[PDB]
């Protein structure tokens, strides 16, 4: 049961990269899945459905006109325009896979992305000032989406899993996503419905398979999948966000996952990876693979 979930962000969102100052347009599937797991823990919903039957996709830009998908990593025959290009609309995706898109069209597509404006809010901490100290400046990156634009993701799962996802997303609307939530960022409203265009696009058979989420194969299937594969091993890491994990904030075990848009000739079913060591509970890093087939 594929469900497209669109998110319109009332407030600017951090979605920070490794730096707090750094701001990203979107977040990977692991971040959204961690948010869902946190919400399920708060809402006291069972995690079996999310861990087993739920397959989500990296949040992707969408404008007033089209929905954007990550640029597939395929051989192309003005390479700089393609390299700077990051997201391709749904209709142009098949054309890009076939290779009909040229450098001028690639630049036009990259300019067509009207997701939002990235800014760097400058803030201070006055906690030290009371204690005979000095204010500490810091910077929080943010990405203010244009009113029609937002972030969408496809979630595939069982009907019960889809309903639990609906409840979790309804709660996450007010919980928020990304960084510096509960400090004025990350608030959004989500609308989840069946998407005809994505249901048709996913129901395709092609010689190549494109990752729609930050995923990583298990050690048994990596040998099969990695052959003839064009990918981008993105470093996913960070600190654990929970109250019961440890007395203090502890970094997650460093993880490396194939980025969205990576093309594999042989598909692999991703695995929920545990990146928690010496903690009271387990930290789930979502690396389940959402695949889109295509012909090149």
């Amino acid at each position: 049961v594929v469900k497209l979930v669109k998110l319109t962000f009332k407030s600017p969102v951090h979605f920070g990269m490794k730096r707090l100052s750094d701001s990203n347009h979107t977040i990977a599937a692991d971040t959204l899945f961690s948010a869902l797991i946190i919400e399920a823990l708060q809402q006291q919903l069972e995690l079996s459905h999310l861990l087993n039957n739920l397959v989500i996709t990296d949040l992707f830009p969408y404008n007033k006109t089209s929905y954007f998908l990550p640029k597939p990593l395929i051989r192309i025959e003005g390479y700089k325009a393609f390299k700077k290009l990051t997201y391709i609309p749904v209709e142009n995706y098949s054309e890009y896979l076939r290779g009909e898109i040229d450098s001028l069209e690639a630049s036009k597509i990259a300019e067509s992305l009207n997701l939002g404006k990235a800014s760097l809010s400058t803030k201070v901490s006055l906690q030290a000032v009371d204690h005979n100290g000095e204010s500490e400046p810091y910077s929080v990156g943010n990405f203010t989406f244009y009113p029609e634009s937002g972030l969408y993701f496809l979630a595939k799962g069982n009907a019960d899993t889809i309903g639990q996802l609906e409840i979790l997303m309804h709660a996450l609307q007010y919980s928020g996503i990304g960084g510096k939530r509960s400090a004025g960022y990350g608030q959004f409203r989500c609308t989840i419905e069946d998407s005809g265009k994505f249901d048709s696009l996913l129901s395709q058979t092609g010689n190549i398979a494109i990752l729609l989420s930050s995923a990583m194969a298990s050690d048994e299937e990596l040998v099969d999948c990695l052959e003839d594969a064009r990918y981008l091993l993105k470093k996913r890491t960070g600190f654990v966000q929970s109250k019961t994990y440890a007395d203090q904030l502890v970094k997650k075990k460093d993880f490396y996952a194939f980025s969205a848009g990576s093309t594999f000739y042989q598909k692999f079913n991703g695995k929920i990876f545990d990146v928690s060591d010496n903690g009271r509970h387990s930290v789930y890093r979502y690396a389940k693979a959402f695949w889109l087939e295509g012909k090149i």
Partner: protein, 721 residues
């Protein structure tokens, strides 16, 4: 051994040209026989018989390196003695900009005038060569790098061919270096093929010489570092500026070490390194099975090293394509296609950057890593009490030394990690000598030292201009001494510049008829020397610290007025050196002295990106609204508007900054009525009539009101207390 003699002969095969212009082979043999060390049979025979006619009559042993030198000269090449060296930019972008006539006079700029090198200048070069060869230079396996450096320092602006019919873009040094590289590759290929008799398959049948041209014996090998720009700016502010000055240089020196390691594994000199740009290194290697095995082992070792040290932050991908002599000679139009294939293989290597075992080891972390460094943000490596990683601490410690000293040392013990279980450090001459003595096979890179004479030293161009370091007090102040202004607003200007369509210039700037390894290598050398040495020459008296200057990217922080003025001067000198053709677009930002370095760099990068947008060759000064052309900013603003306003304000005894601010408010109000109020203010101002009319006309029209606003802002910034 024999290869050493062949390299010495090939690098000196056309040394006879200089003495003849003061034939190319008959006199060069005598000149080299004058010196005892170079009187070796392999060298003098290579010099004397590198021409086909002399080789026909040569009484050799059918296995002398002279045939290899002759065929290498033929591949590299494929009669006024006073003819000058034509600049590479004469043919670069000749289809669009045109075919200029700029030539180099006897770092130097092409002057476009008609100049002929006098025989007296060639004689002076001849006695310089005699003094260097007789006493300073010597023949040895470790001394050939000194020979190459000496050739680079002398023959860099000597025409390869006196023939005025063909273009004289390729210098004597470039031609000799390419000939030496080709000779080394061909010697290795023949040794692999067990070619005991060179004459049989090289010279004696002309058809077999043509076949050897068609035979695939060379390897165009490109190694590119990925993650460079991320690595440089993967920093926190705490010492960002230092790291900003260091990391780039680090990713420079490390890269050089890389190629040297490769050239150490193939037993080839720096001549085979065709050209190194920003993170890219293109080399010409033999097609031997040993060469390919060395390339594979080197790729595996360097991937392992980068995974061990920087994990996925940095990587190096090296891809090779086999080619024939025809491909290097651009026959059949496959040279550009050859480089296209090399870069396509490089991109395919980039896509599949890691293997199965490496990915599994990436994901098979044992512990969380608890504390992490501030800059690298990595917990796998041990982190000191200062929350700095060992590599990060090494980079920070390097920064100052690399800014001060001049001898980089790849020693077993040093500051920052380098590939083959060594560390880069920066010391003076005495420190470099001590490092050489204590540990043998230790590489020394001399910064901005064309001087030859040190056998175990390779020259390494690097722009390290820092006005604060001129005085110890200003060095202690740092960038804060730049805002130490008794007059003018204390601010730091940040300039970030990038060449526009430089990649296309290397790809398709040179026409098909002029495409060659020699010409592209010459262009790369000139660009690198401009952005390393000539960039330092341009910024001489300015209060500017060059944080880094790559192949095309340049980032420097200094006094705002000095930064703007030197950006204009740099644009003018770039136009002079590139003879039109290449242009660059820059972003200039004004910030307070205590403004964070990361914020200044980010905002200036945004300004430069906006300047690149649309029409290139533009500078984005201060706010984004003020994107102007280089000629527009230099003349239409400062000369046309700012200077007359300064003259009027300094001459008028009844005017001051208040009048300027009133003008600025009227110009920025933009209510369509403030034109009349500005006219009224000018009428009551008792200013110059011509200046009053000029100001009114500039205000009445767009694209000139903004320039007048920019001029007024510049003036009021300049005349601050």
């Amino acid at each position: 051994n024999k290869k050493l003699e062949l390299m010495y002969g090939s690098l000196l095969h056309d040394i006879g040209k200089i003495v003849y212009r003061s034939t190319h082979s008959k006199i060069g043999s005598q000149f080299l026989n004058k010196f005892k060390p170079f009187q070796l049979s392999g060298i003098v025979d290579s010099v004397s018989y590198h021409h086909y006619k002399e080789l026909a009559s040569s009484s050799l042993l059918d296995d002398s390196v002279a045939y290899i030198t002759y065929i290498a000269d033929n591949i590299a090449s494929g009669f006024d003695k006073r003819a000058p060296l034509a600049s590479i930019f004469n043919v670069v972008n000749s289809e669009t900009k045109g075919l200029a006539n700029y030539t180099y006079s006897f770092y130097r700029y092409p002057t476009d005038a008609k100049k002929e090198y006098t025989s007296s200048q060639y004689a002076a070069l001849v006695n310089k060569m005699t003094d260097d060869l007789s006493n300073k230079l010597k023949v040895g396996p470790d001394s050939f790098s000194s020979l190459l450096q000496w050739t680079e320092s002398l023959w860099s602006y000597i025409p390869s061919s006196t023939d005025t019919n063909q273009v004289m873009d390729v210098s004597l040094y470039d031609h000799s270096k390419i000939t030496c590289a080709i000779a080394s590759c061909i010697y290795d290929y023949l040794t692999e093929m067990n070619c005991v008799n060179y004459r049989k398959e090289l010279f004696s049948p002309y058809e077999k010489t043509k076949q050897f041209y068609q035979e695939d014996v060379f390897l165009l090998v490109s190694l590119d570092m990925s993650g460079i720009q991320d690595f440089i700016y993967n920093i926190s502010g705490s010492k960002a500026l230092k790291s900003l000055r260091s990391r780039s240089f680090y990713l420079e020196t490390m890269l050089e070490s890389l190629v040297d390691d490769l050239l150490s594994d193939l037993e080839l000199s720096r001549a085979n390194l065709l050209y190194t740009g920003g993170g890219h290194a293109y080399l010409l290697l033999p097609n031997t099975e040993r060469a390919r095995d060395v390339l594979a082992s080197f790729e595996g070792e360097m991937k392992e090293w980068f995974i061990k040290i920087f994990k996925t932050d940095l990587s190096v991908a090296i891809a090779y394509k086999a080619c024939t002599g025809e491909d290097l000679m651009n026959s059949n139009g496959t040279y550009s296609d050859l480089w296209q294939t090399v870069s396509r293989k490089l991109s395919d290597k980039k896509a599949h950057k890691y293997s199965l075992n490496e990915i599994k080891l990436f994901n098979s972390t044992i512990h969380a890593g608890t504390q992490e460094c501030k800059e690298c943000l990595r917990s796998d490596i041990d982190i000191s009490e200062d929350s700095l990683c060992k590599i990060c601490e090494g980079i920070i410690a390097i920064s100052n030394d690399l800014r001060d000293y001049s001898f980089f040392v790849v020693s077993p013990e040093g500051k920052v990690p380098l590939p083959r279980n060594r560390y880069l450090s920066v010391e003076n001459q005495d420190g470099a000598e001590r490092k050489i003595k204590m540990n043998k096979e230790t590489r020394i890179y001399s910064k901005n030292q064309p001087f030859v004479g040190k056998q175990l030293v390779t020259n390494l161009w690097m722009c390290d201009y820092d006005f604060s370091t001129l005085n110890p007090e200003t060095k202690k102040q740092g960038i804060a001494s730049y805002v130490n202004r008794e007059v003018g607003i204390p601010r730091l200007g940040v300039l970030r510049a990038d060449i526009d369509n430089l990649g296309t210039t290397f790809i398709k700037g040179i026409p098909e008829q002029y495409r060659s390894i020699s010409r592209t290598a010459t262009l790369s050398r000139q660009l690198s020397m401009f952005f390393k040495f000539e960039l330092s020459n341009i910024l001489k008296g300015a209060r500017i610290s060059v944080i880094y200057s790559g192949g095309d990217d340049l980032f420097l922080i200094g006094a705002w007025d000095d930064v703007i003025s030197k950006a204009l001067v740099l644009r003018k000198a770039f136009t002079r050196f590139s003879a039109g053709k290449l242009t660059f677009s820059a972003g200039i930002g004004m910030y307070p002295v205590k403004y964070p370095i990361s914020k200044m760099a980010s905002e200036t990068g945004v300004l430069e990106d906006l300047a690149k947008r649309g029409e290139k060759n533009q500078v984005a000064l201060w706010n984004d609204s003020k994107v102007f052309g280089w000629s527009q900013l230099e003349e239409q603003i400062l000369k046309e508007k700012m200077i007359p306003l300064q003259e009027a304000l300094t001459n008028s005894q009844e005017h001051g900054k208040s009048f300027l601010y009133k003008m600025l408010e009227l110009l920025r109000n933009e209510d369509q009525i403030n034109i009349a109020r500005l006219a009224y203010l000018l009428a009551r101002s008792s200013l110059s009539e011509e200046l009053t009319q000029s100001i009114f006309a500039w205000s009445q029209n767009k694209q000139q009101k903004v320039e007048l606003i920019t001029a007024i802002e510049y003036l009021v910034y300049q005349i601050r207390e």
